[PDB]
Design a binder for this molecule. Structure first.
Ligand SMILES: [Mg+2]
Ligand SMILES: [Mg+2]
Lengths: 82, 82, 386
RNA sequence: GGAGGUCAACAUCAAGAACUGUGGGCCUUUGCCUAUAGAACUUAUAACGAACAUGGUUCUUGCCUUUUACCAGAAC
RNA sequence: UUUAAUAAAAAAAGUAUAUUUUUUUUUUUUUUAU
């Protein structure tokens, strides 16, 4: 197969144009930022769980209960950080 | 049988102006496994006959060694025999 | 990374080894350059033939065939031999990587052989084996030196313009029906890098040997410089030149030899060497030995020739100091223009007689057999010399 | 009347996917639109020939002493 | 681990001239008688 190689024709070349393969040619502060964000996120996950359990089965009572849960868990994490 | 074989190897080796071309012709001959040491011996003995070293007889030996394990074991035998 | 240029006829590309990112081994064409302080290879200088030198060679082979009309086949073979020896001898290294020069060499040999064939009025391949053209001139053939029976690298023109791929596919150079191997001239000529490296250590050894001979006054030994009598780049044999004491005064001779092109019609191919000052820089005696082993020997040459019908006892009596006789007498006479070109077909009749079994053979491609008048010879087609 | 012919003449065979005839209307016959009757043979991995030669002119090359005779691609 | 294969002859009229790559140098230490 003419695979890009070879003469275009053997007419003006004075050869046969016989082409053949060559057998000789084979051959930190930012870490603390994400860990702080992970802890504050877990605390906020707790109060979103509270909102899901409350609203699943009183808007102001659920919002104030979530705010008091954020207050209690924020004080608890201020105590658990020291 | 030995002399006519040396003549065939020498005439292959003694046309073919590139090392890749002589390596193509000799790997196209597909000499049997027993006579590979004889072929390597004829190549080295012909390399001695000129007035200096040339990179022809190095290139053809490299293209022999990177073809198959048998040619490399022929050269590892021929270094000890030399 | 590449710094490149083009000196006398050479196109050179110097590339330092710290800019390669893989060090591979190379063929003849690459000179590897020496730091000379630490004696460590620090570059490679890749060689190739300039294009105007390729065109000069092509034009020279054109000028042979135009200038030589009625011109005694042996003389055409001799002119081809000189025009190829000068080429291969000047840029030795850089023939190898030059693709269009290999192509033009193939076309040049087939033009010279086609000249002999059209002289015989037959371009048929089977009448003309390599025995006709490539036997030496003492066995009867034309005596021409081959450089075309190699394989040309041919690999992927679209990527060869961009990458320098390598030699992945070979393609056929110049063949015949019977597969004789024919040696090329390039194996028999020593490349320039090797001969320069040899010349350094040879003239260094001569420096130490001469400077130790002038110590204890041994005053010389020609016996000592015998294997080193033909090394060296000024050729050690020219130190003991026949007349050196009058060649001590010839200064400015390379330029004097080069400027003979502007004041001489018949040029010279060897404008670069001067044998008195520089030696014999090349020798082609072993080529004529290896071609006779390439064609198979004197038996397989002489079964083509008409030697069997002569009845000499031995082939060794083919060799004599043969005097030309008639045409030697006739070339000096007062002789017409038309009558002088007739003299040059006297050697061609002898050449056509000697290879007449092979020319008038029977395994022909097309040809209507005719018979001579008062004999019984059937000659296939029509050759007028035979 | 029927079958047949290595018999003849005359039409016809390559094109908006392509034919002819007729009636009615519009333009002023040609042509356009509308309604109708028939279409053998050849054709879509396109052509009568499940086959396949040569000649001319102009370009582009190849053999290279010039013309025939040629090398091998293109257009008409 | 595998695959590419050009050519191929008849008739008529011609043609200037030189062209070349091929083999060691010869260099000898000795003067009869005191
Ligand atoms: Mg005339
Ligand atoms: Mg004329």
């Amino acid at each position: 197969s003419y695979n890009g190689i070879g003469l275009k024709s053997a007419k003006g070349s004075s050869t046969s144009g016989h082409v053949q393969r060559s057998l000789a040619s084979n051959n930190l502060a930012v870490q603390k930022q994400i860990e702080t964000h992970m802890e504050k996120r877990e605390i906020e996950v707790q109060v979103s769980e509270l909102r899901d359990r409350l609203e699943e089965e009183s808007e102001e009572q659920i919002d104030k209960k979530c705010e008091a849960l954020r207050a209690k868990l924020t004080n608890e994490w201020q105590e658990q950080q020291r | 049988n030995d002399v006519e074989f040396k003549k065939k190897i020498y005439l292959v080796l003694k046309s073919s102006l590139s090392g890749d071309e002589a390596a193509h012709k000799l790997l196209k001959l597909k000499i049997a496994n027993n006579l590979k040491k004889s072929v390597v011996d004829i190549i080295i003995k012909s390399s001695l006959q000129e007035s200096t070293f040339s990179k022809f007889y190095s290139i053809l030996s490299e293209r022999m060694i990177t073809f198959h394990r048998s040619w490399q074991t022929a050269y590892n035998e021929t270094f000890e025999q030399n | 990374p590449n710094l490149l240029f083009s000196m006398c006829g050479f196109e050179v590309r110097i590339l330092p080894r710290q800019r390669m990112e893989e060090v591979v081994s190379n063929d003849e064409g690459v000179w590897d350059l020496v730091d000379e302080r630490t004696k460590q290879r620090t570059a490679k200088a890749y060689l190739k033939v300039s294009e105007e030198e390729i065109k000069k060679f092509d034009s020279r082979i054109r000028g042979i065939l135009m200038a030589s009309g009625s011109t005694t086949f042996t003389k055409v073979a001799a002119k081809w031999n000189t025009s190829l020896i000068s080429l291969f001898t000047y840029f030795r290294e850089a023939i190898v990587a030059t693709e269009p020069l290999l192509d033009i060499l193939v076309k040049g040999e087939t033009r010279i052989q086609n000249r002999v064939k059209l002289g015989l009025n037959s371009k048929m391949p089977t009448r003309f084996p390599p025995a006709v053209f490539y036997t030496p001139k003492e066995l009867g053939g034309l005596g021409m030196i081959s450089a075309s029976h190699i394989l040309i690298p041919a690999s992927d023109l679209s990527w060869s313009k961009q990458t320098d791929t390598g030699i992945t596919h070979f393609r056929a150079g110049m063949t015949h029906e019977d597969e004789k191997l024919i040696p090329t001239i390039f194996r028999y000529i020593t490349t320039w890098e090797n001969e320069f490296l040899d010349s350094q250590r040879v003239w260094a050894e001569y420096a130490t040997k001469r400077q130790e001979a002038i110590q204890q006054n041994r005053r010389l030994a020609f016996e000592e410089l015998e294997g080193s009598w033909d090394r060296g780049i000024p050729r050690i044999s020219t130190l003991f030149q026949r007349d050196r004491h009058t060649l001590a005064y010839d200064r400015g001779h390379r330029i004097r030899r080069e400027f003979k092109q502007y004041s001489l019609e018949r040029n010279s191919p060897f404008w670069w060497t001067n044998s008195h000052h520089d030696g014999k820089l090349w020798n082609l005696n072993a080529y004529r030995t290896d071609v006779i082993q390439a064609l198979g020997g004197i038996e397989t040459i002489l079964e083509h020739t008409l030697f069997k019908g002569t009845g000499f006892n031995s082939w060794e009596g083919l060799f004599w100091e043969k005097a030309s006789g008639f045409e030697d007498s006739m070339q000096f006479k007062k002789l017409t223009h038309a009558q002088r070109t007739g003299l040059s077909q006297i050697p061609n009749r002898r050449f056509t007689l000697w290879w007449s079994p092979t020319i008038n053979r029977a395994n022909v491609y097309v040809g209507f057999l005719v018979q001579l008048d008062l004999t019984g010879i059937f000659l296939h087609g029509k050759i007028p010399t035979l």
